[PDB]
Structures are given as C-alpha cells and as structure tokens.
Amino acid sequence: LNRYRALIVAVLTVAVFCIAAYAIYDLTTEVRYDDVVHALTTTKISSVLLALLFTGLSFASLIFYDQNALEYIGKRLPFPHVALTSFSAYAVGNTAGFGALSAGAIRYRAYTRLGLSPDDITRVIAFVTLAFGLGLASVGAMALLVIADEIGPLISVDGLWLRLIAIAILAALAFVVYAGRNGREVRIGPVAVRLPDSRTWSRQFLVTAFDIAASASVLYVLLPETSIGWPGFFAIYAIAVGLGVLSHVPAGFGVFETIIIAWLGSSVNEDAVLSSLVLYRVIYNVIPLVIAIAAISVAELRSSMRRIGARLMPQLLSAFALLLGMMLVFSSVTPTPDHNLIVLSDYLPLSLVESAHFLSSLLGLAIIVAARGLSQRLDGAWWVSTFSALFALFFSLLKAIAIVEAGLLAFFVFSLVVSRRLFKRPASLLNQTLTAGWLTAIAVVCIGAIVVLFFVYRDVGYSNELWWQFEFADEAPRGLRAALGISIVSSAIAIFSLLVSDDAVARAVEIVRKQGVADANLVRMGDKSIMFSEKGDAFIMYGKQGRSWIALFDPVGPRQALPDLIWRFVETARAAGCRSVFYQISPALLSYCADAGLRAFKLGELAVVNLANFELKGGKWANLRQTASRAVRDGLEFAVIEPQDIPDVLDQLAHVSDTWLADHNAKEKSFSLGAFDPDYVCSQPVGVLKKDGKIVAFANILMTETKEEGSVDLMRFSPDAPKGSMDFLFVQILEYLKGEGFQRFNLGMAPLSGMSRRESAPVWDRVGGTVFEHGERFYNFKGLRAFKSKFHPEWQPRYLAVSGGVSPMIALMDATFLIG
Amino acid sequence: LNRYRALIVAVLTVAVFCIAAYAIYDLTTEVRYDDVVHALTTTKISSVLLALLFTGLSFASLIFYDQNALEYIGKRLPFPHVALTSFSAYAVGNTAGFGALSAGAIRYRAYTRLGLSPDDITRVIAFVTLAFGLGLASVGAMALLVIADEIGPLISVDGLWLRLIAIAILAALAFVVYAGRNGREVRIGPVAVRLPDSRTWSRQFLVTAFDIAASASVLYVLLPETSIGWPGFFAIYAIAVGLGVLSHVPAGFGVFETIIIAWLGSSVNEDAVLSSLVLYRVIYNVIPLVIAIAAISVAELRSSMRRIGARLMPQLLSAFALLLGMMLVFSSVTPTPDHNLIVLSDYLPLSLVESAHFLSSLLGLAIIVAARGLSQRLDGAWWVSTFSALFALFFSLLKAIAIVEAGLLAFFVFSLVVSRRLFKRPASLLNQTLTAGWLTAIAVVCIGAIVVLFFVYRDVGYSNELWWQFEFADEAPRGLRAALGISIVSSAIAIFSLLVSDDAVARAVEIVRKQGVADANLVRMGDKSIMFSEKGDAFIMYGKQGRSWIALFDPVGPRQALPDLIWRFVETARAAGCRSVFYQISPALLSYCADAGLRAFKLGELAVVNLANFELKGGKWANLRQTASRAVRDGLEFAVIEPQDIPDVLDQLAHVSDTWLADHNAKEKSFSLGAFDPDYVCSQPVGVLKKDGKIVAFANILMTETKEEGSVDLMRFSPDAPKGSMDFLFVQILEYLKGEGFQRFNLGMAPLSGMSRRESAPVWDRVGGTVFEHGERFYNFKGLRAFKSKFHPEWQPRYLAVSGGVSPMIALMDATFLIG
C-alpha cells in the first residue's frame, strides 16, 4: 500500500474534487455567470470591509494557535517572530496544504531559523494540527447539536439525525479526553494521542472556536442577508471546512464550496452564494498571502523580521504563484465584459487579442508549474515565473482591462524582483518528478477550469464551429480554446512527470583523513555511492533504496563547503526523481537541511566521550575499573594492529567475526554498521583483544589525521570471551585513542531513553514507535544504552532528514532495508 | 450610607421585585390561571426528563466551578467532598442568596470543615463568584452579539442596539483582561481585580458557559416548541439570569421571570411561558435541594460524606424550609381543582376545610420564619419547623389532595427528624432582629403571593362580600383570606423585628491566671463587658460598638468550654439585635466560629518567640546582641517591678507614658492596646528600663500562673532614651520571662507582609486594603514588622470573625472605632 501511497492519495483527492465539481455543476443549473457577476458587483462595501476585519481576527487567532503551542512545549519566542511564522504558515496552509507548502513545512523552516529543536518543532506542529482538527470537530459538533432542527430542514434531513451525529462525535471526544486525563496515552489503533492538560486545551479551544467563528463570519457577512442566523451558517461552515480539510484538496477548493452551495441552495439564491464564495476565497485566501508577501517585501526594501521573512519568502511566493496561475487560468475561461471587449477592439488587432488570451491561459499554467521551483529557490524558476508574470500582466492588460488581475500580477513581479537574492539554486524545473501534491494542484486547477467553462457556457451549446470563431462576438471560442490548451498542456506535464569506483573511494578517504569525523571512514566499505563537491573538497556518501537516495552521515569535508553540498545532493536526488534522505545527521547541519526543504526527525543519540577529561583512575569510572581489572585477571590482552600487517591476523579475525555472528541471531548489516569485507577491515587499524595467544575480540578503530575524533565501527566477540570483553575492549581502545592525541571518542549510537520520549508530540501516530523500533533493531549491536552510559558520555542527538515533506515512515523503512 | 446599608439594599431589592411583579401582572393580562394549569398538565414527560438531565449537567459544571477554584489556589481536596460542598452551595445559592444561605456561607462552612484557611476560602469564593459573574457577562455578550437581529425584533428593538451593548460589554471585558495580563492588579475604583492566567480562566469559561447552557436548556426544553432557536433563548436566558442575580432578589424569582415573560411574549403564548417558568423553578431549584437533602439524610441513615453533610444540613434545611413555606403560601393563594374540592366536601366539614386552608397559609409563613432558626441550629426552631411541617402536611391533605405538596412536606419532616441531633442550640426564634435578607425573603414571598392572588382572580372582581363566602363554591374567598392573613402576619413579623463591675473582672482575672494566654490580661482594663460561661469556667471579654458586639481575643478558659461559649456569645449578640464580632482569634477556634456562622478574615500575624529555643548567646540574634550591648554601654538598666510596690514608681511611669504619647502624634487607644489606667498598670508587674537612676522605658508584663505564655501590652519611651531602647527592653523582658519558666513570649501583632498579600483573592475589592490600613494604624505602636522579625518569631495568623454574613468592612470599622 505504502509503495504507492502518494499516488493513491493524489488520485483519491482528485476523484473527490471531481465529485465536488460535478456536485456544484449539478446544483447550479439555474445559475448563470451573469447573475454571479451581478451579485459580485452589487455586494456592499460594508460587507467587504467587515469580511476583511474578520479575516484579520481569524489570523490573529491563528497566531495564538502557534503561541499556545510554544507555551505548551515550554519554549519562549518573541511575539513578532511567532506572529510572522504563524501568519505565513496559515496563509499558505489555508491555500496550498500539500507537501512543500503545508503549514507544517512553513513552521519547520521558520522555527528551525528561530532556534527550535526538531522534536520541539514536531511537538508544535502536532499540537497545532490536533488543536485545529479536534477543536473544529468539537465546535462543529456543539453547533450542530444546537441547531440541528434549524439547519436540518435546509437539506431535508430530520434534526434528530444531525443531533445524533453531533452527539456521537461529542461522545467520542469526551471518551478520548476522559481516557487521557493525566498523560495516559490513549491509542486508537495506529495513532497514540496524549491530550494536554485541561487548562491548555481549554485555552486552545477558545482560540480555535474564535478562529472558526471569525472565518465563518467572513463568509456570512459576504452572504446576502439570508434567513438562517449566524449559528446556522456557522455550523454549516464548520461542517464544510471539516470536509474540505478532510478531502485533502488544496484549500478545500472543491469540497467546501460544494457543501455550502448544496446546503444554502434553498435559503439563498445560488448565484449569490457563488458570488459570496468567490469573494470569500479572494479575501480569506489571497488577502493574507498578499499581506504577508507585501510585509516581507517592504521589510526587505527598508530587523529580524527581515531574516525570518527571507527564510519564508520562497514558500509564500510559491503559494502566491499557485493562486496567481489559478487566477489566470480561471480568467482565461471566464468571459470578459462586453464593454472591455469593444474597448480593446477599438485599439487592438483581433489575432493579437486571441493570442493574448490563449497565452495568458498557458502562462497561468506555466506559473503554477514554476511555483514548485520557486518553493525550491531555483534560479531558473525565478526567471520563468518572473517573465511569465510580466507577460501575463501585459496579456491581461491586452486581452481585457483586468485591473485587479494586472495589479496582482504586478505585485507578484514586485515581490519576485525584491526577493531576487533568495533564488540562486541552479537546478532545473523540467528535470523533476513534480509531486503527488503538485500534480494534485495542477489537476484541481484544470478540472475547476473545465467545470467553470461548462458552467459559464452551459446555455450555449457545444458547436464544432465554436473552435474557429474569432471575431470578438463572444469569448466562448476563446474560453473553449483556452480550456483545451490547459487540458493538453497539463496532460503533457503529468506525462512528463511520470516519465561506485575505486578512485572515488580513494578521494573520499583523502577527504576523510583531512577532516575530523571518524565515522566518515564507513566510506571504505565501497557500498556507498559517493557524491563529491564542485571543488572536490567535500563529499556525500549515500546509497539508493526504493524511491529515496538515503544519504549517510553529514557531508564530509570543510565546514563551509557543506551547505552547498547538501543543496546539491537534494537537487540531484530530485533530478533522478527520488526523495533525498539524510541518515544520522548532527544538529549542526539542521539549519542547512531545513533550508533545503528537509525536515529532521530524531532517531537516536550518539554517545561521545571527551578523552581530555577521561582519566580511568578517577571516581567517574568505578564500574569500568572493576570490569577492566577483572578482564585482566581473566587473561585478556589488548593490542593495536596497524592496517598494513593485518591479514595474518585477519584470518582468525574472520573466524571470530563469524563466531560472534553465529552467537547472536543477526545477519551482516551494511551502509551504516560494520560489514566484514577483508579489504575494508584491512584498510584500517584494528584494536584486537588477545587472550592466551589467540584473539577473542577485535574492533575496527576509525581514525582521522586531524585527530579531532576517533571511533569504532564493528566489534565481535567469540563465546570464549568473558562477559566483560565488551567493557575491556572499549576501555582499552578509548585509552589508546586518548593517548594517541584524540579529543573525543564515539561510542556509537543508542536508542532514545524513555524519559526523552516522555516529552513527545500530542498526536504523533507511528513516527515515535517506528523510530524506537529502528533504534532497537540497529543500535544495540555495540552495547545497550546503559552500557554506553557507564562511560558517562556526552549524548549528542542524531537526526533523520527527509525531503519533500514525505512521511518519516517510508524514509525510515527504506533506511532499515538499506542497512539490512 | 453604610450606617443603613443592609436596610437600603433590602428596600431596593424589594422595590425591584415589586417592579418585576407589576411587570409580570401587566404582561399576563390575557393569561388565566386555568390556561397555566392546562399548559402544566400537557407538558411532555420527555421534556421533564430532559430538563432533569440538564439540571444534573448544570450542577456537575458547578462542581467543576469549585474544583477549578481549588486547583487555582493550589489546594487539593478529594472529589466527593468538593462535589458535595459545591452541590450544596449552589443548590442553596440558586434558591436563597442572602446572608446565611449564600453560596459563600455554605462554602466557608464546608471548606473550614474540610481544612482550608480562611484566606484560601476567601480566594475560592472570590474565584467562583468572579468566574460566574464575568463568564456570564462574557457568554451573554457573545450570544447577544451573535443573535441581536434574531431576538431584537421580539422586543421591538433594532438588532444594532443589542449588538452595540454586547460589543461595549465585550470591549470592557477585553480591556480588563488585557490590562491584567500577568498579575498587574487593575483597579476600577473600589474594586481591585487580578484575573487568573489565561489557561485557568479559559477552562473556567468553558465550565461557566456549559453551566449557563445547561440551565438555559432546562428552561428551553420545558418551553413548548417556540419559533426562536436555542441560541435565541440562550441569550435571553443569560440576560434574564444576569438581571436576576444583579437584582439581589432570592433566586431572581421576580426579575428572571419578568425578563423571560416580557421577552417571549410575542413568540410563545404567555400561559405556556408561565407554565414553563413554574416547572423550571420547580426542577432547577427544588430538585437539587431535594437531592442534596435526601443524599445527606440517607448517609445519616446508613463515610466522610456523613460528616460534611452534617455540617451542611442546617443551611440546606433552612433553604428547603424557605422554599417549602413559599410553596405553602402560594398553594394557599392558588385555587384547588374543583374535583378535589368536591372530593373533600364529600368527607370533610366546611369550617374544618376553611380553617385548614388559612392555617396552611399561616404555617407556610411560620416555616419560612423558622427557616432562619434552622440555619442557626436552634432547637426551638427545629421543634417549630417540624410541627409546622407536620400540621401543614395534614392541612394540605385536608384542604386539598395536594399529593406533591404532601410528599414534599413529608420529605422535609423525614429529613428534619433524621437530622435532629444537629439542632440543639437553646436560643429563641422570636428574640432576634431577623435579617435584611430574611425580611427581603419574607417580603418577596408575600408580594409574590399578593400578585398571584391578583392574577388568579383577576377576572373575578373584588367584592366586599367575597370576605365572608364559605360554601366551597370558589376559593377566591379562601385565597383572599389567606392573602390577608399572610400580609398581616408578615407585617407583624417585620414590625417585631424592627422593634461591667468589679467582681466580674475579679473572676475574669482568676480564670486568666488559671489558664495559659497572657493577652487575656487585657480584661483588667475594665472597659470590656465580660460574658461568663455557664459553669463560670470561661469568659468572653467584649465591647459593644455600633451594631456589633466586638468580642476581644479567644474565649479565655478551659479548652473544651470554649465552643459553647462562642455559640452563646453569638446567640446573645443576636438576642440584643447585634452582629457578634470576634477580634484577633487564633486559628484553633476557626472551626468553632465557622459552626456558629462566623466567617474569619485574616487581619495580621501574632509574633511568638519560643523561649525554650531562645539563647541570646547564639547566632540567630546577632543584631539583638549588638543592640543590647550598645544599650548597656548607653547606661540603660532593666528591673522588674512587682505589682504591689509600683505606685512610687508609677508616678514617673505616668510621666514617661505621657512623654511618649506626646512624642508620637497618637491618642490613647483602648479595648485592644495599652491604656494608662493607674489601677490597671498597678495590677500587673511592669518591666521597667532605668537609666541614671531615672526610668526612661517601661512595659506592662502580662503573665499567667500556668506559665504557658507571657506577653507585653504597652510600652513607652521618653525622648531621653536612645534608639535601641525598644530592642533592649524587649530582649530583657524576653530573657526574664524565659528564666522565670515561660515557654513562649508574645511580641504582639504585626501587619501582613507584602508577600503574604500577593496570594490574594481574584476579586476582593476593599477587604484587603482596609485590613492593611487597620494593621498599619494599630499594630505599629510596638515596633514594625521588621523589628519583630529581628527576634525570628513564629508568626501566628490572627483572624477577625464576623457574624451573619455581614461585610468585613463594617465590623472592621466598628473595631477600629472601639480601639480609638
């Protein structure tokens, strides 16, 4: 199932949007586009201003969503930063909720820039998401319970049934809250939700209820004085928003309008409802994006607001470009007023006007294609989107008057040229499998355009001669040609999207010795494809598995050459149509990974012992001294074999490794743990534990010339060894490394402690459990966490960075299979 | 103004109730009592069961009111105790909200039994009261904001005006919340409200909103399928409840019904609204009292629930008796069905039936008179109420069938005889000025009966021959005679309610020496009236001022003889028509004061130095050793003068006292501080500080034979003394007392520290400020708090107990005037 999870969820989303579009088309048979436009023109200025006010109130409540999340996890951040990240995250989530533009992605980027651990960012995202979903369910259930007899008749449903649905929902929520009184993680199968204390989720319930009330008030004020009061439309709006977010359609664009049109058909004229929905979409979705984009652009023109806005601009501009191209496509489909048509006919040629219409349509589709590249800071995407926006500005001033269209396009161009510096990546737009979410957006825009064409020109029949009509008489030929062009080019886009050595290892080892990370010596295994930097200074060892390029530890090389290497690895993985995965990265590289659109997830702690402060003849290692002394009394001796004179000992090294592999029912792992390749083990010094002449324990010592850090990859123990062989081998290797001039020693990886997992996300479902399972499977081959704690090391968190907003499940499983 | 505050507030409450009653009478001109009864009989059983369910839900939310208050102050109490005290407090507050039956009084009694400090009880009461009031204002304002256009037309008011009222209220509340972000006590003139943190008041807002929703749902379900939805009636109900609680009428009995009748006149037939209001009053007010009373009675029949219910039973029974007598009066006014009338005529004599009607009316009035005595655990009140209830049971089975009336009366008798033990006090019902609140209740019941008579027999004219009609034809003669009897007897009740030595001091001093409280020696001043115990073992020194018998320190004498003395003092003060006040009582007597209906308020801390652990040659008194040594180097010497050889030194004792009184611009206080009476000072040993032959400082040493504790009353310092005379005199007296065999020494009283006042009530208005002002005025004549802290004493809180639920302002001011 998860082999095609993205494809199946995208197909289901497009199918649900198709059902919604058909429902709107069927429910608006008596509504004509002229009636919709007349309702739009007759809307009161008071209504629009009051809708703007309630949009502002809703987004303030969203700011407090994020504020409450940060307060719950304990972190304190300055209010301008939290307000800006919350406003941007919600302005993009309410518009484009798929992978790179989800509110979670915005929050991760901004909070990583703001100085939050990935666990803290995950906790904030989980708190906010569970808050919105659960509070929306609760508020909708209470509103439905209140007014089932007032809004039930509108859809010819008895109020008792809606009341019972609301009661069932409220009973489920009450059972969840009561079963999760004080901690006490309740499991509903895969998910394991741990609700906050009553005070926190109570304040969050006020925040979420006020948010939903303000948004419903936006749309209600934009409605033309209906018969149902505010509570009625509020429950209707809560149900519609719940269904829209549950359908995974971007912004719920189909389902929300479908539900509201289907519901208010009897109460309000559907042309007025459609005009109100159009104006609500415009205000509540475009105006926040325009406000955020303009604020950041002005801050760039003229403190820390500038830096956080620079971090957030690529995604805000990607969302705005998606909306802008959607606008261009829809405006191509919808007809120009006759007055504007005759005005342009008085000045412009016919062929120029028709070509401008078709090109504006195709340029809108090109803009929503290049929006993904804008989200990735692509220089080519900046050029394509800038020129497409400028040409569409001109072609909208030509194919019509398009005052607001031209204003929006010019504002996009302004914000795009003001933020030029942020788009410098050299990857190519047309060399990438786009996304399940991005093809979902393309398909939604295209099908919406087709349905809008069928709705606008429903009265006019489909004549085969309508294709070639040109003489300004009607834009049905123009709309039909634009829709055909959109369909063809989008199908082309979808079709296009769905259609080692020895010197490398040598240079990698040269780089490894030139730097100070001992674990980089795993490149010698030869099973990792090596990706070198542009200068060759740094490299990224990686292995390909499934649909992911699972990179190993941090890019190895000079410090300043690492961010560009991370960017280049991610872009190259996308070029091969794969999602880049960084396995076991240090916290130092999280910000650079975050810029590359990679979200990190903690999967263990790397035990580091500082050899400068390690003196075994001290009180901090009493159990260690006892175990070492008893091992000495058992007859074990430790020697360091140089890599050149190994093989005569390598033969029974293979013997002891095979015996230890037989002793514990485990296979030979790779790509992250020691694999007994005779050349690999020969290439490095091997600390070996010898007893009674024969050797019973050995451990590949990982070293670097700079002597910043040393480590051990694999160690094996024959049953002839005593129980303290592990402790004695570690102590001897650590002492040898300290004597030789090493600052720190890497004990390896350990799974996260239970106390660390206690402060976990409110709504994480399987990520924590699968991280724990992976840690148990792979990190216990070199001593348990208690054993490594016996050395009193400096625990360093290690993270798993995944790309494209994909789930940690699939990347973690791909890494698990690559190791196994 | 405060000289007659109780009278003016009672008169205003009765006037507001009269306006409300006239409004109901004017709004129900077209409604006949037969229509009301028909609507009552035709109510659906489903409606009644669902109203019971929502009453239960509302009272659960009230339990959580008190739970949230206790959580906010930090105290943890077992849930059964909190639930029982909250249920009882709200069942009585929703019915009889005046002095002895307010929810605050119930909470103080129960929480004192549960082990809460009076400051903690004050904080809980303030949190709960501010929660209800502020949350009701907020929820009503939001509901009105939502539906001003849906409920505005019902009273012919434009929705814009109700919306603007709601917006003004919400703006005021938002300004208060924002101005009180983190602590930051906001002052609105007299009051100083410090809102809790957002999480606490958010959970409390959910609790209060659910409470109001459940109560509004009770009444809405009891309504007959109106045209306005639940939000409409909910805002109407919130406004009605706000006005009812704001009018101080018991249970809002007039104003709530007035508002709802006036509002729903157009939507619903007013006979149906009146029936719904009657049934809502019955359910939501009687059923909780019946439930609590029955639960406690069963617990008495068959663990700690029994003890807390025994504590709460007198007040629950007083509230139930008030409702029961109200029922009896109303049933006397309202007519019996003709079928029951002919059934009783078939078996009973005419004169017996008419006498039973009149006597049932007068017995209901007698029951609501004896309810106050029941609240005071009076044995005579138990007898009067029991016999009145039994005779009214029989007279209701005689004057009518009265199945529910007889059931309620029999249940009252059952609960009254089951809880017989609790009513043992020997005071007299008819020897007390009743209360402003109790005359308010009497007047409300009487005026309601008069208006119900005018409403039932509005169609029938007022014929002078209606007085003497007797032959079962109609109960208009019976109702008119009963109403006249009620009016006459209530006027009689209101008219009736509004219409030292040397051997005593000798016996008081004998008791003082026989016990171990040194401060009891203030009785020797002779200005305190002395009230001895029945055996004469113990006494209460007290002084009368204003309308209060301001008792001094704890009753002096044997430990077990004190509770009865406290009870007897309170009862005697009520007999003289005065509110007993206990000044500076120890925490040990709070529970006994709480049983006597006295609520304590902390007014300072009494500094106690344990002489057993006091060794001046230790590090704990370095500043003391330095000051004593410097005073010695200044030439001051300390001597102890026995009480018999004083006067030769008393002459310049008067000299030095006069000089010190002149030095500090203060007068000669009394009743709590040292007054220079030559006999008084002669009667006790006087530690005197002599320098260069003359004496410059002296201090009346207060002693007891049992040597449990010693103290000092007044000390004076001529300007010839140095700055350390106070310290040296205290140190010398303390050392002398320790040597003579005293366990502890009383430094005196100090005002509360600022840190102590930081954990103050959310909504206390003037009590804290006036307590601080009184402490500053009176407790700084013997060294400041820092000075007394230089001795490192054991701070003991001292409380001010006031009676009858009167405000601490007036009792504290009376004490201030008595001292000055």
Ligand SMILES: CCCCCCCCCCCCCCCC(=O)OC[C@H](COP(=O)(O)OC[C@@H](O)COC(=O)[C@@H](N)CCCCN)OC(=O)CCCCCCCCCCCCCCC
């Ligand atoms: C009736 C419900 C009972 C159970 C039904 C089935 C259960 C299945 C459980 C599925 C779990 C999650 C699935 C995918 C959710 C997801 O992937 O997202 C997470 C989202 C936060 O998302 P996010 O935090 O990122 O952003 C939020 C904002 O931006 C997006 O809203 C917009 O689009 C804006 N345009 C409008 C908002 C305006 C506010 N200013 O939370 C959720 O799970 C949502 C769950 C909601 C559940 C349905 C609510 C039903 C209403 C109650 C009435 C019931 C009556 C039913 C009768 C038919």
Ligand SMILES: CCCCCCCCCCCCCCCC(=O)OC[C@H](COP(=O)(O)OC[C@@H](O)COC(=O)[C@@H](N)CCCCN)OC(=O)CCCCCCCCCCCCCCC
């Ligand atoms: C299932 C799918 C089918 C659809 C169902 C949904 C129902 C509706 C939902 C909302 C759709 C709206 C989209 C349409 C936008 C568009 O067609 O634009 C055109 C307009 C003006 O354009 P134009 O300038 O050319 O008109 C000329 C004028 O200005 C000059 O006339 C004057 O001034 C007057 N004096 C003359 C009066 C003459 C009278 N005869 O744009 C706007 O409304 C504002 C710009 C914002 C548009 C962006 C919309 C995107 C929001 C959607 C969010 C969902 C996100 C999903 C992502 C996948």
Ligand SMILES: CCCCCCCCCCCCCCCC(=O)OC[C@H](COP(=O)(O)OC[C@@H](O)COC(=O)[C@@H](N)CCCCN)OC(=O)CCCCCCCCCCCCCCC
């Ligand atoms: C519109 C308001 C704005 C300002 C108006 C004037 C301000 C004056 C301020 C006066 C301060 C206090 C005065 C005396 C209050 C008092 O002495 O008491 C304290 C009580 C808790 O009392 P308590 O805790 O003891 O018990 C509670 C329960 O038992 C009693 O309720 C019952 O009787 C039950 N039968 C029914 C309850 C069912 C629940 N289960 O809180 C308060 O201050 C109350 C203040 C309320 C303010 C008015 C609310 C207005 C609604 C908003 C809509 C406005 C529209 C206006 C249009 C005209």
Ligand SMILES: CCCCCCCCCCCCCCCCCC(=O)O[C@@H](COC(=O)CCCCCCCCCCCCCCC)COP(=O)(O)OC[C@H](O)CO
């Ligand atoms: C992450 C966000 C999640 C938001 C979820 C919102 C869900 C709201 C609707 C469901 C609420 C069901 C509550 C039913 C009671 C269950 C028992 C219970 O919860 O007991 C808790 C206490 O229960 C409550 O206090 C409940 C308060 C709310 C009561 C229900 C209100 C529902 C909403 C009513 C709105 C009505 C409005 C009408 C007028 C507009 C125990 O609390 P604790 O000990 O965990 O608290 C620890 C403390 O915080 C530490 O400081």
Ligand SMILES: CCCCCCCCCCCCCCCCCC(=O)O[C@@H](COC(=O)CCCCCCCCCCCCCCC)COP(=O)(O)OC[C@H](O)CO
């Ligand atoms: C003692 C009980 C008092 C109850 C009072 C209830 C009043 C509710 C109505 C008025 C609310 C006005 C709030 C306006 C915002 C003012 C700014 C503000 O309050 O900032 C605070 C934060 O503001 C908020 O979070 C406000 C949350 C609620 C937002 C407003 C909701 C109003 C109710 C809407 C219901 C809508 C329902 C419609 C559908 C039914 C700061 O909090 P803090 O730092 O003091 O918190 C400390 C923390 O708790 C320590 O742990």
